[PDB]
Amino acid sequence: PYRSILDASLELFKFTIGMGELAFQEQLRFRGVVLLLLLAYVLLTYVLLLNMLIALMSETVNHVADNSWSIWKLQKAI
Amino acid sequence: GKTCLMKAVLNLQDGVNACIMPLLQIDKKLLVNAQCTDEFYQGHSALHIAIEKRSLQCVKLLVENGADVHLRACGRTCFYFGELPLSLAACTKQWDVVTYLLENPHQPASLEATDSLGNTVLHALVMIADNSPENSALVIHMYDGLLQMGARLCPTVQLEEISNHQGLTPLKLAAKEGKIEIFRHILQREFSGPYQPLSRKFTEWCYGPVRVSLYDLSSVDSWEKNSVLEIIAFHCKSPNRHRMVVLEPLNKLLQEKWDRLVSRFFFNFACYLVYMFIFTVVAYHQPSLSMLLLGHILILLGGIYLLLGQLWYFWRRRLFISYFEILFLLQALLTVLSQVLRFMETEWYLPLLVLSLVLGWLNLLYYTRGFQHTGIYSVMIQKVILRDLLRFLLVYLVFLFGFAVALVSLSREAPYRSILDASLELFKFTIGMGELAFQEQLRFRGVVLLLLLAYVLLTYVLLLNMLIALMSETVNHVADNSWSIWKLQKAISVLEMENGYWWCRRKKHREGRLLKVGTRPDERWCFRVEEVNWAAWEKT
Amino acid sequence: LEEISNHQGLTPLKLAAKEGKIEIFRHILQREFSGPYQPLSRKFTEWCYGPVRVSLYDLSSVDSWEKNSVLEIIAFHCKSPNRHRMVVLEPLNKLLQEKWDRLVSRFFFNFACYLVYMFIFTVVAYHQPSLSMLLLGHILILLGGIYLLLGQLWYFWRRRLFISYFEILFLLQALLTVLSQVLRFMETEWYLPLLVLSLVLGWLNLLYYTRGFQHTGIYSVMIQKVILRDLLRFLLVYLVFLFGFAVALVSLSREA
Amino acid sequence: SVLEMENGYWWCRRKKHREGRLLKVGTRPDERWCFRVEEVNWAAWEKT
Numbered sequence: 065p066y067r068s069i070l071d072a073s074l075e076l077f078k079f080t081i082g083m084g085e086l087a088f089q090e091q092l093r094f095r096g097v098v099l100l101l102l103l104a105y106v107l108l109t110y111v112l113l114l115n116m117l118i119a120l121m122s123e124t125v126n127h128v129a130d131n132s133w134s135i136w137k138l139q140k141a142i
Numbered sequence: 143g144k145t146c147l148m149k150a151v152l153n154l155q156d157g158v159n160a161c162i163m164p165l166l167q168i169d170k171k172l173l174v175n176a177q178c179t180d181e182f183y184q185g186h187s188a189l190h191i192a193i194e195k196r197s198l199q200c201v202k203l204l205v206e207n208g209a210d211v212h213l214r215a216c217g218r219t220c221f222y223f224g225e226l227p228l229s230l231a232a233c234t235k236q237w238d239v240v241t242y243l244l245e246n247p248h249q250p251a252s253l254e255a256t257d258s259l260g261n262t263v264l265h266a267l268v269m270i271a272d273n274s275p276e277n278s279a280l281v282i283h284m285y286d287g288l289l290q291m292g293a294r295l296c297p298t299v300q301l302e303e304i305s306n307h308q309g310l311t312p313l314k315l316a317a318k319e320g321k322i323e324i325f326r327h328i329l330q331r332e333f334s335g336p337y338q339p340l341s342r343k344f345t346e347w348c349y350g351p352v353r354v355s356l357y358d359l360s361s362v363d364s365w366e367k368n369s370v371l372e373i374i375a376f377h378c379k380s381p382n383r384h385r386m387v388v389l390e391p392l393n394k395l396l397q398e399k400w401d402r403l404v405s406r407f408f409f410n411f412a413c414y415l416v417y418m419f420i421f422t423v424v425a426y427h428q429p430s431l432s433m434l435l436l437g438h439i440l441i442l443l444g445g446i447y448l449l450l451g452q453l454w455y456f457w458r459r460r461l462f463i464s465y466f467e468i469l470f471l472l473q474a475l476l477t478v479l480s481q482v483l484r485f486m487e488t489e490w491y492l493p494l495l496v497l498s499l500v501l502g503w504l505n506l507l508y509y510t511r512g513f514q515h516t517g518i519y520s521v522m523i524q525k526v527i528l529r530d531l532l533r534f535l536l537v538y539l540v541f542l543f544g545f546a547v548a549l550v551s552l553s554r555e556a557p558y559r560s561i562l563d564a565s566l567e568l569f570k571f572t573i574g575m576g577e578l579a580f581q582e583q584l585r586f587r588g589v590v591l592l593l594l595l596a597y598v599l600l601t602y603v604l605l606l607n608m609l610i611a612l613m614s615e616t617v618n619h620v621a622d623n624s625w626s627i628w629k630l631q632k633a634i635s636v637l638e639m640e641n642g643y644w645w646c647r648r649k650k651h652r653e654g655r656l657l658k659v660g661t662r663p664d665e666r667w668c669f670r671v672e673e674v675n676w677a678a679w680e681k682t
Numbered sequence: 683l684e685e686i687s688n689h690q691g692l693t694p695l696k697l698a699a700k701e702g703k704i705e706i707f708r709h710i711l712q713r714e715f716s717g718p719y720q721p722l723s724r725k726f727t728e729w730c731y732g733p734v735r736v737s738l739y740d741l742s743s744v745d746s747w748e749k750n751s752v753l754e755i756i757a758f759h760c761k762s763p764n765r766h767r768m769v770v771l772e773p774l775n776k777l778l779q780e781k782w783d784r785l786v787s788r789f790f791f792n793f794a795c796y797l798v799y800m801f802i803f804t805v806v807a808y809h810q811p812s813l814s815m816l817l818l819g820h821i822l823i824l825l826g827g828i829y830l831l832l833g834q835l836w837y838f839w840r841r842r843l844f845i846s847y848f849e850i851l852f853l854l855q856a857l858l859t860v861l862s863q864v865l866r867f868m869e870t871e872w873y874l875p876l877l878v879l880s881l882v883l884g885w886l887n888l889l890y891y892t893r894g895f896q897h898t899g900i901y902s903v904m905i906q907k908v909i910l911r912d913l914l915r916f917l918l919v920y921l922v923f924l925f926g927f928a929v930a931l932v933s934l935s936r937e938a
Numbered sequence: 939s940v941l942e943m944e945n946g947y948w949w950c951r952r953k954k955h956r957e958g959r960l961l962k963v964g965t966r967p968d969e970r971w972c973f974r975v976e977e978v979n980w981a982a983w984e985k986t
């Protein structure tokens with residue numbers, strides 16, 4: 065568990081597809097600090113996802129349906 | 143505490159009363175100087191009472207009676223206008239009182255007189271202003287009239303360059319109060335007639351659609367010890383900070399500062415990213431039990447330098463007490479604490495080193511405001527997301543501890559062995575990992591399942607509420623606001639670094655070039671904006 | 683003529699509020715006359731000094747001191763959706779601000795004395811034996827439950843025509859706490875589940891006081907108004923799907 | 939919230955207090971209770 069950069073990176077990325085475990089595993093020393101860091105990582109990943117969603121919504125609000133049809137006509141011209 | 147003079151100065155037919163003159167004649171202490179002494183209003187006399195009534199005849203009679211216009215009121219919701227009778231004309235949009243109060247018979251009542259609160263007539267006209275368009279127009283017209291009249295009374299005195307008790311000129315006071323309506327008029331003020339020396343904006347030569355626009359940078363170029371830019375960045379407190387920055391020539395001056403200070407901003411970014419990378423490398427190869435020693439001494443020097451680089455910031459800017467400005471101090475402090483704890487109680491040093499590394503990797507996001515294609519992106523994280531997620535998380539923790547204690551109390555008969563385990567299991571239903579089981583090893587499995595179902599429903603309710611709040615904020619949001627606040631952030635960045643690093647104390651350089659118009663010499667610093675405007679040209 | 687009640691006992695000023703007819707109500711409340719009809723006016727100006735305007739208002743049958751007034755009718759007896767719109771209009775907004783700035787000293791006391799009860803309930807539940815100070819908690823939670831039970835029955839004894847989301851939960855939680863502390867003497871097997879079900883309802887009812895803070899009032903609205911109005915409809919359809927698919931799966935999975 | 943608590947707690951039955959102050963205008967005496975709002979309005983004043 066977390067033997068190298070690759071394993072830890074994979075475990076942290078696992079909290080995107082909603083699969084990673086958030087455990088107070090005590091086989092590894094400083095379990096409290098590990099749990100706190102994982103909690104902070106989860107919070108920051110949710111912050112980033114919320115920021116991406118808000119950016120997409122801001123783009124959608126300023127968007128217009130006729131613009132999509134116009135750019136599709138441009139693509140057909142190309 | 144009202145005297146017979148106040149009763150005479152009271153309202154009467156046609157806004158005048160012959161008893162006011164008869165009372166003064168019958169007196170021959172002056173009855174005109176009599177004023178109330180109550181805590182609600184002390185010093186309010188007939189001189190201001192008649193002026194507030196907009197009675198030109200009564201004011202003229204009182205002046206002829208020997209009333210001293212230089213007398214100032216005091217005392218306590220009320221009118222925040224100045225105590226000077228000359229500033230009392232702000233209660234009249236037609237300047238009827240001021241028309242006589244300037245060059246009156248045997249009572250000059252000069253505008254240069256300072257009020258009891260310090261602010262002059264021009265400063266009072268900006269303090270008593272409002273953001274409403276009607277109030278804005280009323281303030282602008284009165285300010286223009288007062289400035290024009292100033293050229294015919296004590297013309298050698300610069301009425302717009304006198305500071306109050308706080309040390310701020312009306313130009314600085316308008317920025318501090320965040321009163322953008324009057325501030326825009328003051329900053330871009332121009333006159334075509336004899337008031338040309340009083341103007342700030344000038345046009346040099348219009349060639350086709352190209353317009354050269356000069357501006358006056360007096361007390362605005364940030365070279366002086368106290369200017370508009372420094373007040374807006376740090377001393378101001380109004381939400382309108384992000385709106386004043388857009389207005390020219392502040393935008394152009396900030397652009398010129400940025401295009402000359404990127405050469406140091408990117409150097410700072412590189413020399414901080416190198417420190418972060420070295421910190422990461424040292425942490426990764428940290429022993430569990432020569433080059434590594436070099437890293438530790440470097441991270442000690444690197445931490446100390448950054449610690450001083452932020453204490454110097456908090457030693458300054460005392461009234462400014464900025465989100466990232468505390469984290470850099472905190473990360474440097476924790477790094478120094480860790481490198482000190484390496485000599486005593488070494489068991490805790492590595493956790494502190496990791497907690498410093500994570501804060502460094504998060505503080506690296508500060509420099510994202512320096513790139514044009516990431517400035518807008520860097521705004522929404524700080525402004526709204528961190529303002530709503532904290533409120534969401536507090537409610538979530540309130541739910542979490544309560545449900546954890548409930549589960550621990552319920553599961554006490556024939557997993558969830560303590561508060562910590564139950565809290566972790568309940569929090570697990572956020573990353574979509576926790577199990578929702580009818581586990582029968584623990585007694586009351588039905589009630590446990592019902593409570594877990596209720597917890598899941600309430601967590602979804604809280605998440606939906608957070609999403610709806612974010613959507614409500616997004617709908618009311620505007621794309622130009624993000625760019626404006628990013629420009630404000632760039633202004634904050636440049637004004638800090640223009641003062642120079644703490645160790646070097648880089649000397650300041652005066653912006654613009656010396657230009658003179660008319661004659662007071664009138665030599666002054668100016669900054670040359672060139673703009674193309676077909677619509678404005680079409681009015682010729 | 684404006685102070686005569688109908689068969690229902692309501693004056694036209696009160697009737698306009700009850701019907702939620704904000705258009706006429708705003709005119710009636712802020713009515714003013716400059717001529718001989720000055721005594722008929724309600725709004726007055728005393729002295730205008732520069733931009734500062736002093737505006738007097740008539741609080742006859744509006745100050746909530748009388749046995750039946752505009753405020754009480756709007757809060758409880760009214761049924762129109764326009765209740766949230768009449769409150770903004772002055773001087774009702776100013777009167778409510780003055781009442782709030784004088785009753786926060788009791789609202790926060792109530793919040794503290796309910797949070798203490800909730801904390802004691804939590805502590806007693808956590809250390810509850812599976813088989814002196816603990817006995818003190820049980821008698822306190824019994825007295826605390828009874829007091830809150832009476833504090834809500836007194837509400838439902840009143841406000842008969844008003845039959846409020848939180849007002850039923852506080853009664854329900856107190857009733858369940860009392861029921862649990864009674865069942866501790868007979869059929870004790872079920873007492874702990876009821877104690878936990880009361881604790882969770884207490885921790886949810888704690889959210890009622892969030893309306894007392896200016897920086898949480900807006901936040902506390904959207905939960906009650908819309909989310910609980912739509913999630914119930916979503917969950918009913920979800921359960922309809924759930925039971926059907928569950929029966930289908932059980933019927934289908936009957937062979938190796 | 940305020941109208942419920944102004945009636946007082948069930949056990950104590952707190953006495954009510956009349957809001958505002960007594961003011962009289964014109965003559966019917968016309969003594970009545972009034973509440974004094976102070977507001978600043980430049981736009982309304984500009985109509986004078």
Ligand SMILES: CCCCCCCCCC(=O)OC[C@H](COP(=O)([O-])OCCN)OC(=O)CCCCCCCCC
Pocket residue numbers: 409410411413414415417443444445447448451467470643645
């Ligand atoms: C030259 C070799 C330097 C080796 C690394 C030394 C430690 C650097 C630590 C570090 O991150 O400093 C950042 C800082 C600039 O960013 P900032 O202060 O704006 O970032 C924080 C803003 N809130 O850095 C500076 O201001 C100094 C940059 C180096 C110039 C030489 C300094 C000599 C001192 C006597």
Ligand SMILES: CCCCCCCCCC(=O)OC[C@H](COP(=O)([O-])OCCN)OC(=O)CCCCCCCCC
Pocket residue numbers: 791792793795796797799825826827829830833849852947949
């Ligand atoms: C003084 C020590 C009291 C020890 C705790 C007693 C049990 C308190 C239970 C409790 O939560 O009561 C809340 C209530 C106030 O909130 P509310 O009724 O508005 O909350 C519900 C709103 N829907 O409380 C009150 O109204 C009373 C507060 C205490 C004052 C003394 C009372 C004496 C009675 C004879």
